Amino acid sequence: GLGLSGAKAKYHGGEIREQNGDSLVHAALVAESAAIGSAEANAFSVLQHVLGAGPHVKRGSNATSSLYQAVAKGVHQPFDVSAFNASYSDSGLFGFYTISQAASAGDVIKAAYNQVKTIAQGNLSNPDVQAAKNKLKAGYLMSVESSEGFLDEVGSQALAAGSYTPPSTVLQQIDAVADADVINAAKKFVSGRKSMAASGNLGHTPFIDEL
């Protein structure tokens, strides 16, 4: 039975907040992104790299990362924030993950959220996207470098589509993403229904309605 295809990724809005009593306050805030098959996936995937995707320089200050620089200017503590992007064959999630102290979480999540909202409203130069595309397409070529990651990528496509599309076409797929698609993806985040999850000491960590 079954025979490929599937059911329905019924998207919803929710927040579960697990009180932890931990050193840090781990949290995440996302909205419904696009599914893996479309060009919207590549817009969100670029938007992840426009925002703070994840560090490249060992012991760096996260320079070209947008979110890290937005929160750093606001609050002065040990923290980390990054852009989280999940894409599946049915649906996908996009937003960001925040790590912080008890009180800092409130500021860090808001300041990161506002930096997504400032991109969503349209403040974005062409070199930012052109760097982010270069980061993404380099990171993709690096992910398929080791044979384990290569095999996982060939097996990803064999199920997802039933085909294979070599790196060069994926490079073209990335480079063809317009700035409008990045602004529309960033706008779909802010406009769309929200999904939150946090765990830590959450006394000064906001709800979704407080955003």
């Binding site: 050193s23 994840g54 503590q77 040990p78 990054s82 992007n85 790590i99």
Partner: peptide, 30 residues
Amino acid sequence: VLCRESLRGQAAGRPLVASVSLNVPASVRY
């Protein structure tokens, strides 16, 4: 887990992916 330097990169890079094996230790990628 004390400073900001080491704390960089620990934020979720991608949906978690559980790997178990016969030989290799069980990992949780991204």
